[PDB]
Design a protein around this ligand. Structure first.
Ligand SMILES: Nc1nc2c(c(=O)[nH]1)N[C@H]1C(S)=C(S)[C@@H](COP(=O)(O)OP(=O)(O)OC[C@H]3O[C@@H](n4cnc5c(=O)[nH]c(N)nc54)[C@H](O)[C@@H]3O)O[C@H]1N2
Ligand SMILES: Nc1nc2c(c(=O)[nH]1)N[C@H]1C(S)=C(S)[C@@H](COP(=O)(O)OP(=O)(O)OC[C@H]3O[C@@H](n4cnc5c(=O)[nH]c(N)nc54)[C@H](O)[C@@H]3O)O[C@H]1N2
Ligand code: SF4
Ligand code: SF4
Ligand code: SF4
Ligand code: SF4
Ligand SMILES: [S]
Ligand SMILES: [W+6]
Lengths: 964, 214
């Protein structure tokens, strides 16, 4: 026996940091009745096999931490100090602030006379850190209160992926999963530092290399990832589209595309209309006055039945594939080398290695994360990756995919639960003011007349109705539709997003902010602006593990508490290992985890904090009345509670959904109260509820499939690592999306040695087939209107093909590909006092703003202070020695950091001039530790663009000077 | 006995191993500062039994050779530390007969600590300034005797860390060296007949650390 673990109860959990979703084992003293005594890896978990990076490996120190919040704290207007208060006081007073602000600000109808039933006087930030059941409950609480300004982390790092990949494949999700990386023949890591930011992914990346894969890192910097790749190719900041356009040209010129896959499964054969053109860097339908395209000019030519015309011979000059060849003919090696700064020799090496995966029995994967995809053409960067993968036949196959790596443990789930201003749960859009009825809302879904096109989104009315029945079970969906707030049809959608919430706050336009599991005083771009702007709030609610730069902004650097009127409530929540629930990882694996120790001190799980808060608001409305009470009074919260507490199990069952009456669906009889077995059995007529149609199948009459810990695999499942009996992934346990594209028209795998699905004895064996139907009878992309992987993507604001528009404004004056320098549908000052390109990025040992990891002594031990990474060339220019203190400054702010002088950074050659990059970690803040430094977001701008609503944190102008 | 095979050609310098060693033993954190390096703590100490050493080497063309070295006691087959300590008092340094772990006891306070560090060919032992006890990696010998992997081996994401019976680990080291030479032609094993922690280096071991090999 090990004394340390004797007498302790062992439970399982899932890491609370990144989206890999590593398994933990937690030992809790006194057979579960005391504190955690140990936290380490779960040896049985199929993703990590017991491995943990330093963040997972230190979760014991995060949880058993005497700096954690212990009880609610209250800061009165103009006060110098916190006062400790009861949960009863804090939640009672917060409910009064919510009700006072809502009653004063609630709008039934907008200026135009359209029903909107909303309050614009309260905003919410957060959070991908909450469990899936908590995220789902939180969004429904905020929407029942009438909020529209509902945002979180996903806006920055997830939001560009969803439309890029949805345009290309029909869904926004990461297409494959972590274990599947070991099946790749060539791994291209580009806009990702996965060895530092998804460290257990390198278990599977290095296993691919063991079986003969080539590993390629394309990054402006040499990182811990680069050290373990076969090829490191430097790229200039923002030169990704030229790099990827050059690879498209290389694939087409050298005939390395997967011909049969391209003909059958992509839109290569579709005939584009005569109104499509591209000239001088502009597509047809450009409106120069409004800086916008008439996308109707990009329509397909339709047959007599309304279906896009196809030429399967691919000879018609207006075939997608022929327009594609013409578009990318400009991306020659000489021009691509000049702009990327990558040598022609290295471009040829990378292109040859990667394009070799166009062979049917080879697979290539692309791994990207946040990288620099935040700028106005980040969607087109991701489109280009999707197009390359479709040309090479890498979508739907083992070791293939677009592995768009999610950031946080539950950013997949928090997005799935609609914690962004434009979406309800399950990616049903938030209604705008012109969607006056449920019938009009449903009318917007595009239809297909192609009998081979599944067009699965035609089922949307079932999902919206079942969602409204989960919230308001005693109302007809058409009546409950009027309870939920609507955004203005006449406003830019970005007016409701992250950056404009900070801008409105700075204009004094919010009374209240929820900072729920986020640190916006460090995570928001232009921290000096945002910290000042928080002083313009009447009230702030911060729900968090520790006191932090947001909770305590009023006593931050340069702040006089006696001049700051903001009322602040600090509500301490419990850590992941102190509560039960699920988190959805980057591969869509929805994993159940259990309580080890009880909540520390008087901390509470988020579900209890939000439900108690909402019950107090509801009580106030029952006693006082006020603005439109129906959405609050009628919300179904009885299904969220058991034994006087928030119930993760009951909320997960509601999110799956259940029958409200005896129902015949899909030729099967279901009884009142039965769990819905899959979203295929939801109805639009009120017979079913489901909080999230993507969850229908996760928690059935068979039990909690998210809690399965079964390693059982068939030989074909085990060969590629599907682990279909370990947890559950949406949709309906399809581990590899688009897997009908992995077989020929008879159901035979392109790569039998790595089969995903195979037609055997009248059924699909292996993975769950992504779309039912006999081989050769359906188009493989079932969430696409037309059924095909889109090379040509005419729903994108910037055009149907990616095109280089320069994202680096200050040092670049010339575009070698066209007369159009900058994005024609998209204010940088470029003050010559700030000649260097500042960038922010992560290190393995710290998490996000560092609020969590700056409280962990072993992680501070390894990375104690903010640093500034510079080249030998810049160090020589500015007289900076390794380890010197430097001042980094911008138009927005200034900070001190320790210089790290390294050959891992080299100058960029731009138009015959060396341009220097300055690297900073954004993991530091004034609260802790001693001499740690403050946020790199003191330096960053807050401009964004009218299309993304995302600030520039990867290329912003700075100066660096030695401090003596 | 037992053996570690440490394939440095797979290391991402994640420092999972550095943290896992301290979590298992509940060791304190040192006071550290950044002096122009990711490396920290800068050295082994009484409270740090493992630290990842970082070395940058220039190469022709893009990037660098970035060398990572998770340093620990080699658990020598014939340990000079024990031969030195035994001059002053037997029992201060002992060897587990089944695993081969070399173990410092509380009796290290009663010997010439500085002399024991000096006897070590790898410069491993560290002295507590207050109590004069010596510390170093103990092979997680209690975990090993209970059928568990050492904390640093279990945590490692990359397959850098490997542990088992000496026969299976020497066979693994031989097989892996032949494969790694296809990528790193100058790869060598560190003192493989003398120690129980056998590092595979991708080049001259002294490029990783002055005391990488004897
Ligand atoms: N250790 C750790 N892991 C994390 C996090 C953390 O804080 N710490 N955060 C998590 C979260 S929330 C997220 S969103 C993810 C983000 O994960 P990543 O996107 O991997 O994060 P970064 O390190 O910010 O950026 C990745 C790389 O992009 C490179 N890059 C910069 N500009 C360009 C460019 O123009 N082109 C290309 N091709 N590359 C460029 C940078 O040099 C950097 O190495 O990480 C997650 N994982
Ligand atoms: N300059 C710059 N800025 C950036 C980025 C960048 O690359 N550069 N990255 C952006 C991105 S991608 C992201 S993801 C954001 C992240 O920005 P934030 O989310 O604001 O960062 P943190 O607050 O550090 O994230 C961890 C938080 O999780 C909370 N937490 C942990 N467990 C729980 C729990 O159970 N409940 C609750 N309620 N809270 C919990 C902690 O208290 C802490 O506040 O920063 C963005 N900002
Ligand atoms: S931070 Fe990510 S890679 Fe590290 S232990 Fe946690 S889930 Fe695994
Ligand atoms: S074997 Fe145990 S004591 Fe030695 S370095 Fe690894 S974790 Fe630390
Ligand atoms: S490495 Fe040094 S301290 Fe460790 S066993 Fe050998 S002589 Fe003793
Ligand atoms: S845990 Fe493994 S990969 Fe990470 S630094 Fe240690 S030996 Fe290297
Ligand atoms: S995230
Ligand atoms: W993120």
């Amino acid at each position: 026996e090990l004394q340390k673990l004797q007498w302790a109860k062992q439970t399982t959990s899932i890491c609370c940091y990144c989206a890999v979703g590593c398994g933990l084992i937690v030992h809790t003293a006194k057979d579960g009745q005391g504190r955690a005594v140990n936290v380490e890896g779960d040896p049985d978990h199929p993703i990590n096999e017991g491995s943990l990076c330093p963040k997972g490996a230190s979760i014991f120190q995060l949880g058993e931490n005497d700096q954690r919040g212990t009880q609610p704290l209250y800061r009165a207007p103009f006060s110098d100090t916190w006062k400790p208060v009861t949960w009863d006081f804090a939640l009672t007073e917060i409910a009064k602030r919510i009700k006072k602000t809502r009653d004063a600000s609630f709008t039934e109808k907008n200026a135009a006379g359209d029903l909107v039933n909303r309050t614009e006087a309260i905003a919410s930030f957060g959070s991908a850190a909450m469990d899936n059941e908590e995220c789902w409950a939180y969004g429904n609480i905020l929407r029942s209160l009438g909020l529209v300004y509902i945002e979180h982390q996903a806006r920055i790092x997830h939001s560009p992926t969803v439309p890029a990949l949805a345009e290309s494949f029909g869904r926004g999700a990461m297409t494959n999963h972590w274990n599947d990386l070991a099946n790749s023949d060539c791994i291209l890591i580009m806009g990702s530092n996965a060895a530092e930011n998804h460290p257990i992914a390198f278990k599977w990346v290095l296993r691919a290399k063991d079986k003969g894969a080539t590993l390629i890192h394309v990054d402006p910097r040499f990182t811990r990832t680069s050290a373990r790749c076969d090829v490191y190719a430097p790229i200039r900041s923002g030169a990704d589209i030229p790099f990827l356009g050059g690879l498209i040209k290389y694939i087409l010129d050298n005939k390395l595309y997967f011909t049969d896959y391209v003909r059958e499964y992509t839109n290569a054969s579709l005939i584009v209309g005569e109104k499509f053109s591209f000239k001088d860097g502009l597509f047809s339908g450009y409106d120069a006055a409004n800086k916008k395209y008439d996308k109707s000019m990009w329509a397909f030519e339709l047959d007599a039945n309304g279906v896009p015309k196809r030429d399967p011979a691919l000879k018609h000059p207006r075939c997608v594939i022929n327009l594609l060849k013409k578009h990318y003919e400009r991306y020659n090696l000489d021009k691509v080398a000049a702009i990327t700064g990558t040598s022609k020799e290295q471009l040829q090496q990378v292109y040859k290695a990667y394009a070799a995966t166009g062979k049917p029995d080879k697979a290539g994967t692309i791994m990207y994360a946040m990288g620099w995809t935040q700028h106005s053409v980040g969607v087109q960067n991701i489109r280009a990756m999707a197009m390359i993968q479709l040309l090479l036949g890498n979508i739907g196959v083992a070791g293939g995919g677009v592995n768009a790596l999610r950031g946080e443990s539950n950013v997949q789930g928090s997005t799935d639960q609609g914690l962004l201003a434009h979406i309800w749960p399950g990616y049903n859009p938030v209604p705008n003011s012109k969607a006056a009825t449920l019938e009009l809302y449903n009318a917007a879904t595009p239809q297909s007349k192609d009998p081979m096109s599944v067009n699965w989104w035609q089922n949307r009315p079932k999902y919206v109705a079942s969602y409204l029945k989960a919230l308001y079970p005693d109302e007809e969906p058409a009546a409950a539709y009027d309870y939920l707030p609507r955004i203005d049809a006449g406003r830019k959608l970005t007016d409701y997003f992250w950056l404009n919430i900070f801008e409105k706050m700075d204009k004094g336009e919010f009374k209240g902010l929820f900072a729920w599991g986020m640190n916006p005083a460090c995570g928001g771009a232009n921290a000096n602006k945002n910290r000042k702007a928080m002083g313009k709030l009447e009230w702030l609610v911060n729900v968090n593990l520790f006191e932090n730069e947001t909770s305590s902004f009023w006593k931050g650097p340069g702040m006089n508490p006696a001049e700051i009127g903001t009322e602040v409530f600090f509500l301490p929540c419990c850590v992941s290992i102190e509560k039960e629930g699920s988190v959805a990882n980057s591969g869509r694996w929805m994993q159940w985890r259990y309580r080890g120790p009880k909540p520390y001190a008087e901390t509470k799980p988020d579900g209890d904090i939000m439900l108690d808060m909402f019950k107090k608001v509801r009580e106030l409305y029952a006693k006082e009345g006020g603005a439109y009470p129906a959405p609050i009074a009628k919300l179904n919260i009885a299904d969220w509670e058991e034994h006087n507490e928030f119930s993760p199990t009951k909320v997960a069952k509601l999110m799956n959904g259940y029958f409200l009456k005896d129902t015949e669906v899909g030729g099967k009889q279901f009884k009142k109260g039965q769990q819905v077995p899959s979203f295929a059995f939801l109805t639009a007529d009120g017979s079913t509820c489901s909080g999230n149609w993507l969850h229908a199948g996760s928690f059935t009459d068979a039990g909690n499939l998210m809690a399965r810990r079964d390693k059982t695999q068939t030989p074909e499942q085990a060969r590629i690592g599907l682990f279909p009996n370990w947890s559950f992934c949406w949709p309906v346990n399809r581990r590899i999306l688009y897997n009908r594209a992995s077989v020929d028209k008879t159901g035979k795998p392109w790569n039998p040695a790595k089969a995903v699905i195979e037609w055997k004895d009248g059924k699909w064996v292996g993975d769950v087939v992504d779309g039912g139907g006999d081989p050769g009878t359906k188009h493989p992309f079932i969430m696409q209107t037309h059924g095909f992987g889109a090379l040509y993507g005419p729903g994108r604001e910037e055009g149907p093909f990616p095109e280089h528009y320069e994202p680096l404004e200050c040092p670049v004056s010339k575009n070698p590909f066209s007369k159009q320098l900058h994005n024609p549908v998209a204010k940088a000052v470029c003050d010559p006092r700030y000649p260097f390109i500042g960038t922010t990025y992560r290190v393995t040992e710290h998490w996000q703003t560092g609020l969590m990891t700056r409280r962990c002594a072993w992680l501070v031990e390894a990375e104690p202070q903010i640093f500034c990474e510079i080249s030998k060339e810049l160090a020589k220019l500015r007289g900076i020695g390794n380890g010197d203190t430097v001042k980094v400054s911008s138009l927005r702010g200034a900070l001190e950091a320790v210089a790290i002088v390294t050959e891992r950074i080299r100058p960029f050659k731009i138009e015959g001039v060396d341009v220097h990059m300055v690297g900073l970690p954004w993991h530091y803040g004034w609260m802790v530790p001693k001499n740690g430094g403050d946020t790199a977001n003191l330096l960053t701008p807050s401009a964004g663009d009218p299309n993304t609503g995302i600030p520039e944190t990867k290329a912003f102008m700075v100066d660096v000077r030695k401090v003596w | 006995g037992k053996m570690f095979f440490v394939d440095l050609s797979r290391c991402t310098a994640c420092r999972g191993c550095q943290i896992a060693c301290k979590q298992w033993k509940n060791l304190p954190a040192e006071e550290t500062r950044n002096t122009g390096s990711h490396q920290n703590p800068p050295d082994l100490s009484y409270v740090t039994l493992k630290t990842v050493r970082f070395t940058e080497k220039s190469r022709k063309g893009p990037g660098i050779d970035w060398l990572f070295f998770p340093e620990q006691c080699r658990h020598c087959v014939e340990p000079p530390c024990k031969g030195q300590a035994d001059v002053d008092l037997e029992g201060a340094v002992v060897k587990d007969e089944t695993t081969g772990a070399v173990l410092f006891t509380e009796l290290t306070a009663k010997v010439d600590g500085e002399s024991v560090r000096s006897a070590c060919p790898y410069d491993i032992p560290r002295i507590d300034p207050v109590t004069k006890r010596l510390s170093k990696c103990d092979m997680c010998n209690d975990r090993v005797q209970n059928g568990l992997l050492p904390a640093c081996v279990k945590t490692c994401p990359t397959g850098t860390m490997n542990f088992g019976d000496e026969q299976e680990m020497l066979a693994l080291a031989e097989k892996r060296l032949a494969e790694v030479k296809k990528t790193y032609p100058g790869a060598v094993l560190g003192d493989p007949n003398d120690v129980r922690v056998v590092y595979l280096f991708t080049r001259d071991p002294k490029d990783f650390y002055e005391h990488a090999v004897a």
